[PDB]
Design an enzyme around this catalytic site. Structure first.
Site, PDB file in Angstrom:
ATOM      1  N   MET A   1      63.925  34.066  29.420  1.00 53.62           N
ATOM      2  CA  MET A   1      64.963  35.078  29.210  1.00 53.62           C
ATOM      3  C   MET A   1      65.649  34.914  27.857  1.00 53.62           C
ATOM      4  O   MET A   1      66.090  35.907  27.260  1.00 53.62           O
ATOM      5  CB  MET A   1      65.989  35.031  30.337  1.00 53.62           C
ATOM      6  CG  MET A   1      65.391  35.469  31.653  1.00 53.62           C
ATOM      7  SD  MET A   1      66.638  35.811  32.879  1.00 53.62           S
ATOM      8  CE  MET A   1      67.383  34.214  33.034  1.00 53.62           C
ATOM      9  N   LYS A   2      65.757  33.673  27.381  1.00 55.69           N
ATOM     10  CA  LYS A   2      66.307  33.385  26.059  1.00 55.69           C
ATOM     11  C   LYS A   2      65.658  34.245  24.980  1.00 55.69           C
ATOM     12  O   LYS A   2      66.316  34.653  24.014  1.00 55.69           O
ATOM     13  CB  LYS A   2      66.104  31.898  25.762  1.00 55.69           C
ATOM     14  CG  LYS A   2      66.665  31.422  24.454  1.00 55.69           C
ATOM     15  CD  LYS A   2      66.208  29.986  24.174  1.00 55.69           C
ATOM     16  CE  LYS A   2      66.825  29.478  22.910  1.00 55.69           C
ATOM     17  NZ  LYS A   2      66.496  28.067  22.633  1.00 55.69           N
TER      18      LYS A   2
ATOM     19  N   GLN B   1      68.253  27.835  41.391  1.00 56.06           N
ATOM     20  CA  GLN B   1      69.543  27.815  40.714  1.00 56.06           C
ATOM     21  C   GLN B   1      69.824  29.198  40.134  1.00 56.06           C
ATOM     22  O   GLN B   1      68.936  29.797  39.513  1.00 56.06           O
ATOM     23  CB  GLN B   1      69.560  26.759  39.608  1.00 56.06           C
ATOM     24  CG  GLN B   1      70.963  26.466  39.088  1.00 56.06           C
ATOM     25  CD  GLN B   1      71.033  25.354  38.038  1.00 56.06           C
ATOM     26  OE1 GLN B   1      70.090  24.579  37.846  1.00 56.06           O
ATOM     27  NE2 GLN B   1      72.172  25.269  37.367  1.00 56.06           N
TER      28      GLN B   1
ATOM     29  N   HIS C   1      66.663  17.228  27.616  1.00 56.84           N
ATOM     30  CA  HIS C   1      67.701  17.905  28.383  1.00 56.84           C
ATOM     31  C   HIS C   1      67.441  17.793  29.883  1.00 56.84           C
ATOM     32  O   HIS C   1      68.318  17.370  30.647  1.00 56.84           O
ATOM     33  CB  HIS C   1      67.769  19.376  27.945  1.00 56.84           C
ATOM     34  CG  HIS C   1      68.855  20.156  28.611  1.00 56.84           C
ATOM     35  ND1 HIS C   1      70.095  20.338  28.039  1.00 56.84           N
ATOM     36  CD2 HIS C   1      68.906  20.759  29.825  1.00 56.84           C
ATOM     37  CE1 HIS C   1      70.858  21.032  28.868  1.00 56.84           C
ATOM     38  NE2 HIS C   1      70.157  21.313  29.951  1.00 56.84           N
ATOM     39  N   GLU C   2      66.242  18.178  30.326  1.00 52.88           N
ATOM     40  CA  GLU C   2      65.933  18.133  31.754  1.00 52.88           C
ATOM     41  C   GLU C   2      65.945  16.703  32.281  1.00 52.88           C
ATOM     42  O   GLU C   2      66.414  16.455  33.402  1.00 52.88           O
ATOM     43  CB  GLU C   2      64.582  18.801  32.030  1.00 52.88           C
ATOM     44  CG  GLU C   2      64.479  20.230  31.515  1.00 52.88           C
ATOM     45  CD  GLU C   2      65.658  21.125  31.879  1.00 52.88           C
ATOM     46  OE1 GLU C   2      66.360  20.872  32.874  1.00 52.88           O
ATOM     47  OE2 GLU C   2      65.880  22.120  31.152  1.00 52.88           O
TER      48      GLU C   2
ATOM     49  N   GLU D   1      76.261  21.183  32.296  1.00 52.92           N
ATOM     50  CA  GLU D   1      75.515  21.442  31.071  1.00 52.92           C
ATOM     51  C   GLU D   1      76.114  20.765  29.843  1.00 52.92           C
ATOM     52  O   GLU D   1      75.369  20.309  28.967  1.00 52.92           O
ATOM     53  CB  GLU D   1      75.410  22.955  30.837  1.00 52.92           C
ATOM     54  CG  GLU D   1      74.678  23.691  31.942  1.00 52.92           C
ATOM     55  CD  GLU D   1      73.303  23.135  32.186  1.00 52.92           C
ATOM     56  OE1 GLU D   1      72.748  22.503  31.257  1.00 52.92           O
ATOM     57  OE2 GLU D   1      72.789  23.314  33.311  1.00 52.92           O
TER      58      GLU D   1
ATOM     59  N   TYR E   1      77.077  25.289  27.877  1.00 54.30           N
ATOM     60  CA  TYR E   1      76.293  24.289  27.145  1.00 54.30           C
ATOM     61  C   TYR E   1      77.023  23.831  25.888  1.00 54.30           C
ATOM     62  O   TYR E   1      77.222  22.636  25.663  1.00 54.30           O
ATOM     63  CB  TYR E   1      74.940  24.882  26.745  1.00 54.30           C
ATOM     64  CG  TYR E   1      74.028  25.192  27.901  1.00 54.30           C
ATOM     65  CD1 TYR E   1      74.203  26.332  28.669  1.00 54.30           C
ATOM     66  CD2 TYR E   1      72.981  24.348  28.213  1.00 54.30           C
ATOM     67  CE1 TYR E   1      73.343  26.608  29.758  1.00 54.30           C
ATOM     68  CE2 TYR E   1      72.125  24.632  29.263  1.00 54.30           C
ATOM     69  CZ  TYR E   1      72.320  25.751  30.028  1.00 54.30           C
ATOM     70  OH  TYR E   1      71.484  26.013  31.087  1.00 54.30           O
TER      71      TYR E   1
ATOM     72  N   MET F   1      63.876  23.583  34.096  1.00 50.23           N
ATOM     73  CA  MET F   1      64.686  23.427  35.295  1.00 50.23           C
ATOM     74  C   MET F   1      64.457  22.019  35.818  1.00 50.23           C
ATOM     75  O   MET F   1      63.315  21.623  36.077  1.00 50.23           O
ATOM     76  CB  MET F   1      64.333  24.466  36.353  1.00 50.23           C
ATOM     77  CG  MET F   1      65.069  24.297  37.667  1.00 50.23           C
ATOM     78  SD  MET F   1      66.862  24.523  37.543  1.00 50.23           S
ATOM     79  CE  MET F   1      67.392  23.400  38.837  1.00 50.23           C
TER      80      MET F   1
ATOM     81  N   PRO G   1      61.541  32.026  33.926  1.00 44.43           N
ATOM     82  CA  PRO G   1      62.683  32.584  33.180  1.00 44.43           C
ATOM     83  C   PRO G   1      63.420  31.603  32.280  1.00 44.43           C
ATOM     84  O   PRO G   1      64.161  32.072  31.412  1.00 44.43           O
ATOM     85  CB  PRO G   1      63.621  33.093  34.280  1.00 44.43           C
ATOM     86  CG  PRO G   1      62.847  33.029  35.548  1.00 44.43           C
ATOM     87  CD  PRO G   1      61.819  31.977  35.371  1.00 44.43           C
TER      88      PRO G   1
HETATM   89  C1  LIG Z   1      77.657  30.500  33.008  1.00 42.88           C
HETATM   90  C2  LIG Z   1      78.133  30.710  34.456  1.00 42.88           C
HETATM   91  C3  LIG Z   1      76.900  30.834  35.369  1.00 42.88           C
HETATM   92  C4  LIG Z   1      76.742  29.602  36.230  1.00 42.88           C
HETATM   93  C5  LIG Z   1      75.282  29.277  36.431  1.00 42.88           C
HETATM   94  C6  LIG Z   1      74.599  30.594  36.644  1.00 42.88           C
HETATM   95  C7  LIG Z   1      73.141  30.751  36.460  1.00 42.88           C
HETATM   96  C8  LIG Z   1      72.279  29.621  36.013  1.00 42.88           C
HETATM   97  C9  LIG Z   1      70.973  29.833  36.688  1.00 42.88           C
HETATM   98  C10 LIG Z   1      69.830  28.929  36.401  1.00 42.88           C
HETATM   99  C11 LIG Z   1      69.997  27.833  35.398  1.00 42.88           C
HETATM  100  C12 LIG Z   1      68.836  26.950  35.069  1.00 42.88           C
HETATM  101  C13 LIG Z   1      69.076  25.894  34.040  1.00 42.88           C
HETATM  102  C14 LIG Z   1      68.016  24.910  33.655  1.00 42.88           C
HETATM  103  C15 LIG Z   1      68.339  23.943  32.477  1.00 42.88           C
HETATM  104  O1  LIG Z   1      69.604  23.976  31.762  1.00 42.88           O
HETATM  105  C16 LIG Z   1      68.508  24.912  31.349  1.00 42.88           C
HETATM  106  C17 LIG Z   1      67.682  24.852  30.015  1.00 42.88           C
HETATM  107  C18 LIG Z   1      66.862  26.198  29.788  1.00 42.88           C
HETATM  108  C19 LIG Z   1      67.823  27.220  29.119  1.00 42.88           C
HETATM  109  C20 LIG Z   1      67.291  28.337  28.126  1.00 42.88           C
HETATM  110  O2  LIG Z   1      66.085  28.552  27.844  1.00 42.88           O
HETATM  111  O3  LIG Z   1      68.248  28.969  27.646  1.00 42.88           O
HETATM  112 ZN   LIG Z   2      70.857  22.151  31.750  1.00 34.31          ZN
END
Ligand SMILES: CCCCC/C=C\C\C=C/C=C/C=C/[C@@H]1O[C@H]1CCCC(=O)O
Ligand SMILES: [Zn+2]
Ligand SMILES: [Yb+3]
Ligand SMILES: [Yb+3]
Length: 607
Positions: free
Chosen positions: A562-563, A134, A293-294, A316, A381, A268, A264
């Protein structure tokens, strides 16, 4: 509507129905090698060719009906990769199918994959591989229509060294000695639920498992298995709650994989196998909202899917909404409101960071010529959640709105949808309250930048103590410093400590003497909870405490969520005393970092 992030033929032209993947993992070459057999269904008459997404793939050949066919790779279009056109030997009419078997090999620099040397793992003796598709990195593993507007089933057979384990986002279908090579094993997988290709996932490493629920194993390296099994013990209780809210769990297994620290994201929701960061291992279950959440993505995101990444808030916003209901049923409605209000604070932070006129603060975004990894933020989110929370309060409360949510999931299960599909159905479900719905400022909520036009109502019970203490520190003068004491924290949960720091950080810098006193009375340096430590170290660096520099550098590099990593590097770069060492540290570590994180930190640091 067009998927501006994909180069492949759109779903209005043809649709991949199934993927059969046979591949082999080579840790010496850092390659995945194999064949991807795509069953494609034409949507039009006289379809004689189609285009697939690819990124840094080498194509050996394309076989249709046992014969090699003509294909061409076009010019690369930066982050989108290269389009691959395939010539069909037979013209297809509507709903006719063909099987296309593409022989491919990945690049070691695949942006979907991180290859870890043994020295980068916990055990130090075996290497490790994990994927993150993703939003649009599945194309850097195999050729595909790399768009969430297409959903396919898949089966996979993966050859790995026999001392390693492979897992995928699918039901495990057994393991056998590799017939051609005796030293390799073959792991089999089957996913019978149609998924978008961004939910394809693979991990290979020295993995062990522990059962924590009737449908849940936790996987990790042996060094983390025990800690993980404790931290996530609530998983089955959350699944049961999620089923009450969203309807039946259709995926069979809900396994958890605890990845190396360079993963990162926090989580997921790969179907059947959620990936999570080891920074969740706080020792007290306090970061389990990430699991909730997941889990919730098993309905909102994985079953009902955004048709393009412009509508990412559907995935989200609804998932945060369900997440907070799970935590509300486990811990009480006052806690749901506490987390909801904290989420509003994070929305404030994101809008301030981007600027209130920035187009990435819109709920529905336009990703034309925008890399989704660069646009990613907490806006979808938390602005998405705020919209749903506001609607809940407008339409008669959580019981009523959860009724809509379940109907919405049932209506759009196995489909890919747009904001208009959602909003049209909201109006259909709430026929008797159309006048109420027409009071919503839809244009502002969906299409304007900045903070939402109205703020929901939040219970303050658990937040009040955080406000009191943050305000005491923000407004403290010299004659207040001696009165602060470790007893200030006696009645605060870890969640309230984190929100205290978030509120204080919003007003950084604080005077350096104040931050030193804060360490003296509260000993935040000793806290290992990653969320608290993150905010604490940001506060220290933004407040110019040189002693925090090594702590912040250590946290930024010893994990790669990355957060945490991106803001810690950005804060260190903004502090004159640490700027040069931040840049040097990034340069020294970037070859060993996850490829997406390395790209984004480099952009952040302007290297
Ligand atoms: C905001 C426009 C961009 C559209 C999406 C672009 C990139 C997203 C890429 C990967 C997303 C993985 C998400 C996994 C679960 O919702 C994530 C919870 C972890 C978030 C975090 O640690 O901030
Ligand atoms: Zn999510
Ligand atoms: Yb090769
Ligand atoms: Yb409409």
């Amino acid at each position: 509507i067009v998927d501006t992030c994909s180069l492949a033929s759109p779903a209005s032209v043809c649709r991949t129905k199934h993927l059969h993947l046979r591949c082999s993992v080579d840790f010496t070459r850092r390659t995945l090698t194999g064949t991807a057999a795509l069953t494609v269904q034409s949507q039009e008459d006289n379809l004689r060719s189609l285009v697939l997404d690819t990124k840094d793939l080498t194509i050996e050949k394309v076989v249709i009906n046992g014969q090699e066919v003509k294909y061409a790779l076009g010019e690369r279009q930066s982050y989108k990769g290269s389009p691959m056109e395939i010539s069909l030997p037979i013209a297809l009419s509507k709903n006719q199918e063909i099987v296309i078997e593409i022989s491919f090999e990945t690049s070691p620099k695949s942006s979907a994959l991180q290859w870890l040397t043994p020295e980068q793992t916990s055990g130090k003796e075996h290497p490790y591989l994990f994927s993150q598709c993703q939003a649009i990195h599945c194309r850097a593993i195999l050729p595909c229509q790399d768009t969430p507007s297409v959903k396919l089933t898949y089966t996979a057979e993966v050859s790995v060294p026999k001392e390693l384990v492979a897992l995928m986002s699918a039901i495990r279908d057994g393991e056998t000695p590799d017939p051609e090579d005796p030293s390799r094993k073959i792991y089999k997988f089957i996913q019978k639920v149609p998924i978008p290709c961004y939910l394809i996932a693979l991990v290979v490493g020295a993995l062990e498992s522990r059962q924590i629920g009737p449908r849940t194993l936790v996987w990790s390296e042996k060094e983390q298995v025990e800690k993980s099994a404790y931290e996530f013990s609530e998983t089955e209780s959350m699944l049961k709650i999620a089923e009450d809210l969203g309807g039946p769990y259709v995926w069979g297994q809900y396994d958890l994989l605890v990845l190396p620290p360079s993963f990162p994201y926090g989580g997921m929701a790969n179907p059947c196998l959620t990936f999570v960061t080891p920074t969740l291992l706080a020792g007290d279950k306090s970061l389990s909202n990430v699991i909730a959440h997941e889990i919730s993505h098993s309905w909102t995101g994985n079953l009902v899917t955004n048709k393009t990444w412009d509508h990412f808030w559907l995935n989200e916003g609804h998932t945060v909404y369900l997440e907070r209901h799970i935590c509300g049923r486990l811990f009480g409605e006052k806690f749901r409101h506490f987390n909801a209000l904290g989420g509003w604070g994070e929305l404030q932070n994101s809008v301030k960071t981007f600027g209130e006129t920035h187009p990435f603060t819109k709920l529905v975004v336009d990703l034309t010529d925008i890399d989704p990894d660069v646009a990613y933020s907490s806006v979808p989110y938390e602005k998405g959640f705020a919209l749903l929370f506001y609607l809940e309060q407008l339409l008669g409360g959580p019981e009523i709105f959860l009724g809509f949510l379940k109907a919405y999931v049932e209506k759009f299960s196995y489909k890919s949808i747009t904001t208009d599909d959602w909003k049209d159905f909201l109006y259909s479900y709430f026929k008797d309250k159309v006048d109420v719905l027409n009071q919503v400022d839809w244009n502002a909520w969906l299409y304007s930048p900045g903070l939402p036009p109205i703020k929901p109502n939040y219970d303050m019970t658990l937040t009040n103590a955080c406000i009191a203490l943050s305000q005491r520190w923000i407004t403290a003068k010299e004659d207040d410093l001696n009165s602060f004491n470790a007893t200030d924290l006696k009645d605060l949960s870890s969640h309230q400590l984190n929100e205290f720091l978030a509120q204080t950080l919003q007003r950084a810098p604080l005077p350096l003497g104040h931050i030193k006193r804060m360490q003296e009375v509260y000993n935040f340096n000793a806290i290992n909870n990653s969320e608290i430590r993150f905010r604490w170290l940001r506060l220290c660096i933004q407040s110019k405490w040189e002693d925090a520099i090594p702590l912040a550098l250590k946290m930024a590099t010893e994990q790669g969520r990355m957060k945490f990593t991106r803001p810690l590097f950005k804060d260190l770069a903004a502090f004159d005393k640490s700027h040069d060492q931040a840049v040097r540290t990034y340069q020294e570590h970037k070859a060993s970092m996850h490829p997406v994180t390395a790209m984004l930190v480099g952009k952040d640091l302007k290297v």
